[PDB]
């Protein structure tokens, strides 16, 4: 699988991965904040 790095520029892949991860984490955290069960700062009670 190391041959992937000859095909694709390792710098551009890392930035694309980090950009995807940053966006995804923000999406998941704010989806949870909108929920009644997983909104931690909102004092959610089950």
């Amino acid at each position: 699988m190391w041959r992937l790095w000859k095909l694709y520029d390792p710098r551009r892949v890392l930035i694309g991965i980090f950009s995807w991860l940053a966006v995804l984490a923000l999406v998941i955290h704010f989806i949870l904040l909108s929920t009644d069960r997983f909104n931690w700062v909102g004092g959610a009670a089950v």
């Binding site: 694309g16 950009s19 940053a22 966006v23 923000l26 999406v27 704010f30 989806i31 904040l33 909108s34």
Partner: protein, 49 residues
């Protein structure tokens, strides 16, 4: 149509077009990335959905 040295009607060579388009795509991804976080904030904090 793979001549690095030819100057096309737009005034660019093919490598120059490829380099310019990469900034266009990178600009789009950053714009889309900020838009997605903007949308989830709109989902989380607006009556939408």
């Amino acid at each position: 149509f793979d001549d690095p040295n030819r100057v096309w009607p737009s005034g660019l060579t093919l490598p120059e077009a490829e380099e310019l388009h990469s900034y266009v795509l990178d600009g789009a991804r950053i714009f889309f990335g900020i838009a997605v976080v903007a949308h989830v904030l709109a989902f989380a904090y607006s009556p939408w959905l």
